[PDB]
Write an enzyme that holds these catalytic residues in place. Structure first.
Site, PDB file in Angstrom:
ATOM      1  CB  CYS A 184       8.523  -1.321   6.522  1.00 39.03           C
ATOM      2  SG  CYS A 184       7.361  -1.691   5.197  1.00 39.03           S
ATOM      3  CG  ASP A 189       4.349  -1.303   0.516  1.00 36.35           C
ATOM      4  OD1 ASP A 189       4.982  -0.233   0.653  1.00 36.35           O
ATOM      5  OD2 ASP A 189       4.782  -2.265  -0.154  1.00 36.35           O
ATOM      6  NE  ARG A 191       3.877  -0.602   4.867  1.00 38.07           N
ATOM      7  CZ  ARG A 191       4.016  -1.906   4.652  1.00 38.07           C
ATOM      8  NH1 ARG A 191       4.923  -2.341   3.788  1.00 38.07           N
ATOM      9  NH2 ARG A 191       3.260  -2.774   5.309  1.00 38.07           N
TER      10      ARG A 191
END
Ligand code: NA
Lengths: 147, 147
Positions: free
Chosen positions: A8, A120, A14
């Site tokens: 990420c 996100d 994440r």
């Protein structure tokens, strides 16, 4: 058939969340696949967000307290059978970063049958974080099926 | 993480069967794995045995009619992420001749944590072919989960 890598941005939410969900599910399946995480722009010394630590434990009994954000090297692209982006923009940059193995770099959704991005959740309350964690676990449940 | 190589002596009975039902299971599930076969001392051009072809057709609905015996070369080992031998004899023959390919060479039982060999149903009554088919189907079930 050993390692999948989730990547990420800051490597605080994440990708470390997917990492913990993959490794706990695979260890409970006897499957010989393990996961790690890296970030395209990671603040190195930092731990996973407290918000991410809480939801994985509370919702799944998974502990990721030992996660430290790590910048993505070429080596983690070498030692991985599969690289999974948390967003299309992450996939976009990966073909650029390390002289491609674009044949093993997908977004996690596209590798599993849908298009889009993983939300996100940084700076968000612990309900959207629950949706993020929950969205991740579902995507991981079909991935292991393929993996 | 796509290829598994089943190894027989002559690539006529077990390996075509092990390859056959693995794919049929790998077809049902959405799995990115494929099976191939070879023999340590196979006569090329030979089909799978008619018993194997009929025991797999009646019991599991898979065909394997288009299989032809292939003697193992260097092409199959390199392309294989994992190579599984039906017996410890096939395993030993490979590792003695092909060292450092040995890292991916295992026996069909030992890879799933068991011991022993899957015995040759050569010229045996269909019930023996049937029993061998059941063991293979059970072992491949464990295989697919580990993979
Ligand atoms: Na995605």
């Amino acid at each position: 058939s050993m390692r999948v890598l989730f990547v990420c941005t800051g490597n605080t939410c994440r990708s470390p969340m997917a990492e913990g969900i993959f490794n706990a599910k695979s260890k409970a399946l006897g499957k010989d696949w393990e996961a790690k995480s890296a970030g395209v722009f990671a603040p190195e010394g930092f731990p996973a967000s407290s918000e991410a630590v809480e939801v994985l434990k509370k919702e799944y009994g998974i502990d990721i307290s030992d996660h430290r954000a790590k910048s993505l090297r070429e080596e983690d692209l070498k030692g991985a059978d599969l690289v999974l982006a948390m967003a299309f923009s992450h996939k976009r940059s990966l073909v650029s970063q390390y002289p491609e193995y674009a044949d093993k770099i997908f977004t996690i959704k596209e590798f599993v049958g849908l298009e889009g991005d993983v939300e996100d959740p940084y700076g968000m309350p612990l309900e959207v974080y629950k949706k993020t964690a929950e969205e991740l676990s579902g995507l991981i449940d079909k991935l292991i099926e393929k993996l």
